[PDB]
Design a binder for this molecule. Sequence first.
Ligand code: 2GO
Ligand code: CLA
Ligand code: CLA
Ligand SMILES: CC(C)CCCCCCCCCCCC(=O)OC[C@H](OC[C@H](C[N+](C)(C)C)C(=O)O)OC(=O)CCCCCCCCCCCC(C)C
Ligand SMILES: CNCCOP(=O)(O)O[C@H](COC(=O)CCCCCCCCCCCC(C)C)OC(=O)CCCCCCCCCCCC(C)C
Ligand SMILES: CNCCOP(=O)(O)O[C@H](COC(=O)CCCCCCCCCCCC(C)C)OC(=O)CCCCCCCCCCCC(C)C
Ligand code: HEC
Ligand code: HEC
Ligand code: SF4
Ligand SMILES: [Ca+2]
Lengths: 35, 38, 35, 145, 193, 854, 50, 50
Amino acid sequence: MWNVVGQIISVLCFFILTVGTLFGIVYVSHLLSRG
Amino acid sequence: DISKVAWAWFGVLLAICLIGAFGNYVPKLFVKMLMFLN
Amino acid sequence: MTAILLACLFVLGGYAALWGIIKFVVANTKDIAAN
Amino acid sequence: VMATGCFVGARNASEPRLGSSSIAASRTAPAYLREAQVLYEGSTDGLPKDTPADEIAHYKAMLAELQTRNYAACAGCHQVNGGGNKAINATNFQDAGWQANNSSPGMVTSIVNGKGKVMPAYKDKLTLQQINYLVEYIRRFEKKR
Amino acid sequence: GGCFVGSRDPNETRYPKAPMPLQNQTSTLKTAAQNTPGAREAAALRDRVTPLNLQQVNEQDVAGNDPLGSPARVVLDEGEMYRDPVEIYREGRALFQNNCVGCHGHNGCGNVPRSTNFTDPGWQENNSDGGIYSSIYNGKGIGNGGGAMPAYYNQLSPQQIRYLVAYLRAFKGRQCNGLPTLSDVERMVAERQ
Amino acid sequence: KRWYQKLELPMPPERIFGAHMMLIGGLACLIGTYFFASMTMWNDGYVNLTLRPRLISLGIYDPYDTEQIQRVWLPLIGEFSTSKLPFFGQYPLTMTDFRLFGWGCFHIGLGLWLVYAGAAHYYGARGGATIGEIFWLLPYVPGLKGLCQIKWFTPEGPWYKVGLPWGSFANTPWPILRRTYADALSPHTIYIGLLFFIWGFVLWFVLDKPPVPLQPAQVMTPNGLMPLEQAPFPYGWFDPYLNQVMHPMNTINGETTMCFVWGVLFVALGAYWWYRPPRSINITHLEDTKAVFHVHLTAIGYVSFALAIVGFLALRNHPSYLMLNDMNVIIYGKKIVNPGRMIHNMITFNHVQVGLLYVAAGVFHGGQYLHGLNISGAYKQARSKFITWFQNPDLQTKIVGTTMFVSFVTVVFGYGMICWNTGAELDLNFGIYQFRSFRAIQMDGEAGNIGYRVFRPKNPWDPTAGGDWVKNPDGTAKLVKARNLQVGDRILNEELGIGSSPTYSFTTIEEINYKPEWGQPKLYAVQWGSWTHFLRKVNPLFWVDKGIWYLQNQKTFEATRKADEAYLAAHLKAVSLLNQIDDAQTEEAKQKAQAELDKFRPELEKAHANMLEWNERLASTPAVLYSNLRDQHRDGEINDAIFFWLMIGGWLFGFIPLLRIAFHNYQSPWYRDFEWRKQSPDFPCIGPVKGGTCGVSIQDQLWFCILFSIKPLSAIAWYLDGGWIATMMARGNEAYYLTHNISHTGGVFLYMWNETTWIWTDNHLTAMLLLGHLIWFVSFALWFKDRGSRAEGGDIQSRWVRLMGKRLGIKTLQEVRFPVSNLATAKLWGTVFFYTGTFVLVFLYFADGFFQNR
Amino acid sequence: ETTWIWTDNHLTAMLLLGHLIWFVSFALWFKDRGSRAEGGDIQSRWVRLM
Amino acid sequence: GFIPLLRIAFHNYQSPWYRDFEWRKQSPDFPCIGPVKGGTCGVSIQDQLW
Ligand code: 2GO
Ligand code: CLA
Ligand code: CLA
Ligand SMILES: CC(C)CCCCCCCCCCCC(=O)OC[C@H](OC[C@H](C[N+](C)(C)C)C(=O)O)OC(=O)CCCCCCCCCCCC(C)C
Ligand SMILES: CNCCOP(=O)(O)O[C@H](COC(=O)CCCCCCCCCCCC(C)C)OC(=O)CCCCCCCCCCCC(C)C
Ligand SMILES: CNCCOP(=O)(O)O[C@H](COC(=O)CCCCCCCCCCCC(C)C)OC(=O)CCCCCCCCCCCC(C)C
Ligand code: HEC
Ligand code: HEC
Ligand code: SF4
Ligand SMILES: [Ca+2]
C-alpha cells in the first residue's frame, strides 16, 4: 500500500531520468552538428 | 546555444539525481533518516 | 474455446484500437497540414 | 581522467585489537592464519609461543564470546590436523582429491550454509571475512597423491 | 537434415509407460501388460529402459516447496536408495545426461572450470550422501540462484535428487570415457552402495 | 538483378492453375514419404515426431500395438525375397506400420497423378511441349535424342496425350465455366465445401470416428471393449493425463462433425455468390493477378498467424502431445524432457514464422503493383476506394507518425520495466540509488521460531532518527524470532547467508505475515526492495483471465479465502502463547503458559490442515487463459504483462516499414521536398547527396521489416519455451519464483546460457549451433557500407592471380576476374544470411526439450 | 567462463551494457542511412504537428 | 588485419580499380561516390582505417 506508492515514485523518476537523458543526447547532437 | 526550456529540464534531472544520492548515502554514513537505510 | 476467443479478440482489438487512435488524431488536426 | 583512485569502499575486516590494523591483518597471510587457527582450534594453545600478551588475550576474548553462542570449533570433528573422521563422515582436508575438487569460492558457501546433516551452518556465528580466513587455513592441510 | 535418421535399437521399446499422476506427490488432499502377442515382452522391456521420473515435476513437488525436501529434513534411507540397480541406472543416467553433462562433461570428469569430477576417489570418500543432496539443493558458491554450481531447489524433486545421488556414486574409479553403465551401477551396489 | 525475376505477374490462368496443381501433386508425394518415415523401425527424428500426435489422434498410429504380422491383404506377408513389399520385409512390421505404409503409397499415387494432370493444363496451354523441354536435362544423355523429341500434352492427340483440346479455358465452350476471377469465386468455394465433405466421410467411414452426436457406445481398446466415456484417449474419451472425461468437441469425433458444419456453410456461401457474384467498382481492378496477389498473399499470412494462436491454445494440454511424453522418445541418442510440449511449440512457432513472412511479402508485392501505377501515370486515375482512401500525403504522414508514437510509448514502457527489474534483481548501486532484491523469510510454523539479531529503528517517520540493536534487559543482543519481526527491522545480509549484494548491509522488513495471492500457502516477512510485483496487474489479460476464473470457481474461492482468514487468526494466537512462554521468568509461569499452548496446539493443527487442503483444491480448478502444464489456473505474472506490452509495441516496430512500403513506394515526404521519385522498386541508393541515401526503396523497406520483426518473434520464442521475459538476469531457483510457484528457464540473457547447458548435451544440436553462427556473421560482410572496398580489393586479387597465371603457364588462371556482389544483391543475400543464421539457432532452443515445471 | 562471470553482479551489469553498445553499431554501419533520414523526417513533421 | 593498412599507404589517391576508371579520391574521409559500377562504399582512407 505504501510500498507500492514508493516504488511507483522510483520508477517514475527512472523514466524521467532515462528518457530525459536520451532527449538531451539528441539536443546535444543537434547543437554540435548544426544550430 | 541552449534554451531556457532545456536548462530547466537539466535542472530537473539534477534534482532527481541528488535526491536519489541523499537517500542512498545519508542514512548510511550518519545513521539518521532511517526510512531509507539498507 | 474461451482462451481461443479471448486471444483472437485481443489481437483484433489491438488493430481496432490503433485505428481509433489514428482517427482521433486525423479529426482533431484537420486544418493543420504537417509540413 | 576518470578513476580518481576508484571509489570501491573500505574493506570489511574482523575485530579490532588496539594498536594493530585489522584491515591490514586481513590481507596479511601470517596474521589471518593465526586468527583462523584460533577459530579452528577453539583455543589459543597451539599458537606460536612468540605470540604477544595482547594478542593472546584478545583471542581469548573472542573465543569467550563465541562460546556463549554455542559455537563448535572445527578441530575435533575434523581433528587438529585434518582428515577428519570416517565414523562421523567428517571431511579429511589432507586429501588431495578432496582439495582438487573444491574451489575456494565454492568452499565458502558450504561453511556458511552447512553441509548435509552434520557439518553445521556458520552464517550466524561467524562473519564472512572469518569464513574466508578458514578456507585459507584448510588449504594448507593438503598432502600429495 | 531430415528422414534419414537410423533404425531404432530393438532394446529401446516405445511401449508406453503409465502417465505422470495429476495429483501432487506432496498432496494432503488424498496423499502422494496384456496377453496380446507381444505385449508382455514389451511391458517387461519398458520396465527396464524407459524412465518414469525424467520430466520436470509439478511445481508444488519441487524440493524447495516439499515439506520434506530441505537438506535438514529429507530421508536418505540407504535400503530404499541402493535397493535396485536397474532403477538407479534407468533414472540417474537419464537425469544426468540431460542436466549435468553440460558442465561436468560427457565423461563426468569436469568440463566447466573447477567443476566437480565424480570419478575421483578422494572426492567420493569425503562426501556423504546427505552432503551431495545439500550441494544439489543449495548450489555451491556465492551468486543469485546458487553459484557456479547452480542450485536446484525450484527445478528438481527430492526423489529426483536421490536418484542423482546414487548414480553419482557409480562414477568412482572409472576411466574418462562416457557415463557409468548398468554394470557399473551394479558393482557399486554390491560393494555396499 | 533478374535471376529471381524470371516469372513475374500477371500470368494467364492456365499457367497458374497448372503450376498449383503440379505443386499440390508434389506435396502429396513428399507427405507420402513422410508416412514411410513414420514407420516404427526408424529412430525418432524431427520430421516423424511432428506428425505423430496427429496420427495418434486419427487412429492410424497405435501406441499399444505389439503384434507382428504375416498375412494381411494377400498371402506373402512376414518377410520375403526382394522385400515382398520392397525394402520393408526386413524388419518386423505391425499393423500400424502397415497402416502407415498404405497411407504413404496412397499419397504417392495421388500425387503422381496430380503432377501429371497439372502438367497437362500447364503445357497444354502452350499447345503441347516436347519431352526434352519438360525434363530438360534429358538430351545430355547420349543415344536418347530421338526419345526426347516427341510432343506430349498436345491439343490434338489420342486420349493419353492430350493437354487442352481447345487451347485455353476461355476458348473451351463448356457453359458451366465461369469467366472472371470474381465469378470464379463462387465455384472455388463450393469446391472447398466438397473437400470438407470428403474429409468428413473419410473420418467417419475409413478411419471410423463418427461425428458427434453419433459416436458409439462402445469402442475397442487394448484392455478389451469398453464404454466410450471410460476408454482412454486414443480409443475413447477418457483423458488419462488430466483424469477427466473429454468434452465432445475436444475429441476427434468433434472434428468430424465440423467437417460437415463447415462444408455446409461453404457450399451455401458459394451458391449465394453463384447468383450474386461480387461486383463493386472497388473490386474491379483486382482481376489483374498482380493486384490480387497482394490481397491473397497477405491474407494467407494472417491465416497462418491465426493457425498459430488457435493451435497453440487448443493443443497445449491435449492428450495427443502428452502421449508423446509417455513413449520413450530418443533423438540423436538422448531422451527428451517433455517431447509433447517440444513438438507442440515447434508447430506453432513454424506457423508464426510463416505468418510474418507472408504478411511482409504480400505487402511488398502490393507496393510493386502501386509503384507500377505511379510509373505509368495511372495511380492518379485509380477508381477503387481501397487505393484512393490513402492517396493524400498529409494523411499518410499522420498515419505513420502516430503509429511510430504508439510504438515508442509501448516499447519504452516495456523495455524500461525490464531494465528496472533487472537492476532490482541484481542489487545495483548507482550512487544516486540502491536497487534492492526480493527476499522472504517464513514467519509461521517451525521456521517462525528461528531467531535473528535485529537493528530496529526508533521512529522511522521522523528524521534525526536513530536505531538500536534489540537487546535484553542486561544489555546483550537478543535474538528475535522470525514470528516476531516488524516492519522496519533490519537484518544483516551476511547472517541470512547472502553474498551477492555487497554494496549494502541489511535486508529490511517491508511487509509481515504476507501470503501470496497465488503461491505458496505460507506466511512471510518480506523485503520488496525495488522488485515490482504489482506490474503483473498492469495487463488487461490478468483481469479478464482472473475475473472469468473467479466467476467460475466462486464457491471454492470463497471457502479458500475464509480458511486463510481462520488460519491467520490461529497463527496469531499461537504466537501470543509462544511469546508468553518465552517471556515467562517463573518456572511456574513458564509451566502454565506451556500448558495453554499445549491445549491450543490441536486446532492450530486443524486450521493449518484446513487451509492447506482448501488451497490445494483451489489450485486444481480449470484454466481460462493462463495455464499450468496440467491444465489448471495460474495467476498472471510479470512475464505475462510484459509479453502483452511487447506484442503491441514490437509488432508496430516491425510493421512500420510495411506502412512505408504502402505509402512511400514512389515519393515520401523527404523525397517530395527535394522533388525526387523512386524510379524502381529496388535501387540501393542514389548516392552520397544530402548526407547519404541508402535504403529508401521498397525492397530495402522489406528487408527492414524482416529484421525488426526478428524482435517480436524472439520474444514469442522465449515465451513459448519457458523463458522469463520480464528481466534479463532472472534465475529459476530463487525466492521470488519459489514462493510464488513460478517456473521458468531463464531471464533474457540468463535463458541463453541456461538452455545451452541442455543444447551442449547433443552433438548434432551443437554442430547446428556452430554453423548457424557462421551463416549470420557473414551477413555483416554484405550489409555494411563496404562494397566499394570489396570491389577495389577483388580487383587487386584478380590482377595478382592473372599474374601468376602468366608467370606459371596456367591458361585458365590468366583471365580470372572475381565477381563482387553489387549493392542490391548484397542487401538481399545479407538479409537471407541474417535470417537463416538466427532462426537455425532458435530451432535449437525449442529442440533441447521443454523444461518448465509441470 | 560466463558461468563464472554470472557469479559476480558487477560483472553481469558490465556484460549487459557491453552487449547493448555493440549491436547499436549495426544501426550505424548497415546501408540504411537514407531510410533513417526519411523516417526521421516523418518524425519531425509529426512532432511539429503536435 | 594489416592488408587494409597497405591499402592506406599505397591507395590513398588511386587504387588500380580507380585508375582504370580515371577516378582520383578527393579527400581522406568521403563515404563513397556510388551507386556507380555496382557501388563504391568504403574506398577512402578513413574507411580502410575502420
Ligand atoms: C549462449 C550460449 C551460446 C554462446 C556461445 C553464444 C555466443 C554468441 C556470440 C559471441 C561471440 O559470443 C555472438 C556474437 C552471438 C551471435 C548470435 N547468436 Zn549466439 N551463443 C550461444 C547460443 C545461441 C543461440 C541458441 C542462439 C543464439 C543466437 C544468436 C544470434 C542473434 C541474432 C539477432 O540478431 O537477434 C536479435 C535478438 C535477440 C538478441 C533475442 C532477444 C530476446 C528477447 C526475449 C526479446 C524481447 C525483449 C527485448 C528487450 C526487446 C523488446 C522490444 C521489442 C520487442 C521491439 C547471432 C548469430 C540465437 C538468437 O537469439 O536468435 C534470436 C539463438 O538462438 N545463440 N552469440
Ligand atoms: C568468414 C569470415 C570472412 C572471410 C573468410 C572474409 C574474407 C575476406 N574478406 Mg570479408 N568480411 C567479413 C568476413 C570475412 N571476410 C566481415 C564479417 C565483414 C564486415 C566487417 C567483412 C568485410 C570485408 C571488407 C570491406 C573487405 C573484406 C575483404 C576480405 C578479403 C581479404 C583479402 C585477403 O586478404 O585474402 C586473404 C583471405 C583470407 C584470409 C581468407 C581465407 C578464407 C576463409 C577463412 C575460408 C573461408 C571459409 C568460408 C566461410 C566457408 C564457406 C565455404 C564452403 C564451401 C565450405 C577476404 C577474402 C576485403 C576484400 O578484398 O574483398 C574482396 C575487403 O575489402 N571483408
Ligand atoms: C536499441 C536498438 C534500437 C532502437 C531503440 C532503435 C530505434 C529506431 N530505429 Mg534503429 N536500428 C537498430 C537499432 C535500434 N533502433 C539496429 C540494430 C538496426 C540495424 C538494422 C537499426 C536500423 C534502423 C533503420 C534503417 C531504421 C531504423 C529506424 C528506427 C526508428 C523507428 C521509428 C520508430 O519506430 O519509433 C518508435 C521508437 C521505438 C520503437 C524505440 C524507443 C526508444 C527505445 C526503446 C529505447 C531507447 C534505448 C536506448 C538504447 C537508450 C539509451 C539511452 C541513454 C539514456 C542510456 C527508431 C527510432 C527507422 C527510422 O525511422 O529512423 C529514424 C529506420 O528507418 N533503425
Ligand atoms: C558449385 C560447385 C559444386 C563447383 C562448380 C564446378 C567447379 C568445381 C571445382 C572448382 C572450379 C574452379 C574453376 C576456376 C577457374 O578456372 O576459373 C576461371 C574463370 O574464368 C576465366 C576463364 C573464362 N574467361 C574469363 C576467359 C571468359 C575460364 O577459366 O573459363 O573464373 C572466374 O573468373 C571466377 C573465379 C574462379 C576461381 C579460381 C581461382 C583459383 C585460385 C587460384 C589462386 C592461386 C594461384 C597461384 C593458383
Ligand atoms: C511457457 N508457456 C507460456 C504460455 O502459457 P499460457 O499457456 O499460460 O498462455 C497464453 C499465452 O500463449 C500464447 O497464447 C502464446 C502463443 C504464441 C503464438 C501466438 C503469438 C502471436 C501474437 C500476436 C500476433 C500479431 C500479428 C498477427 C500481428 O498467454 C496469453 O495470454 C497469450 C495471448 C496473446 C494475445 C495478446 C494481445 C496483444 C495485441 C497485439 C496487436 C498487434 C498489432 C496492432 C500489429
Ligand atoms: C558483375 N557485376 C554486375 C552485377 O553483379 P552481381 O551482383 O549480379 O553478381 C554476382 C552474382 O550473383 C550471385 O550472388 C550468385 C549466387 C546466386 C545463386 C547461388 C549459386 C551458387 C551458390 C549457392 C548454391 C550452392 C549449392 C546449392 C550447390 O556476384 C556476387 O554476388 C559475387 C559474390 C559471390 C562470390 C563468392 C563469395 C564467397 C562464396 C560463398 C561462401 C559464403 C559462405 C560462408 C556462406
Ligand atoms: C545437475 C543436476 C548436476 C549435478 C547432479 C551436479 N551438478 Fe555441478 N558443479 C559445478 C562447479 C563449477 C562445481 C564446483 C563447485 C566449487 O567447488 O566451486 C560443481 C560441483 C558439484 C558437486 C560437488 C559439490 C560438493 O560440494 O562437493 C556435485 C555433487 C555437483 N556439482 C553435481 C558446475 C555445474 C553446472 C554449471 C553451470 C551445472 C549445470 C551443474 N554443475 C549441474 C550438476
Ligand atoms: C562436526 C560436528 C563438525 C564441526 C563442528 C565442523 N564440521 Fe565441517 N563437516 C563435518 C561433517 C560430518 C562433514 C561432512 C559433510 C558432508 O558431506 O556430509 C563436514 C564438512 C566440511 C567441509 C567440506 C565441505 C565441502 O564442501 O566439501 C569443510 C570445508 C568443513 N566441513 C569445514 C568446517 C569448518 C571450517 C568448521 C568449523 C568452523 C567445521 N567444519 C565444523 C563436521 C563438522
Ligand atoms: S555507401 Fe552505398 S548505399 Fe551509401 S550512399 Fe554510397 S552507394 Fe549508396
Ligand atoms: Ca527448451
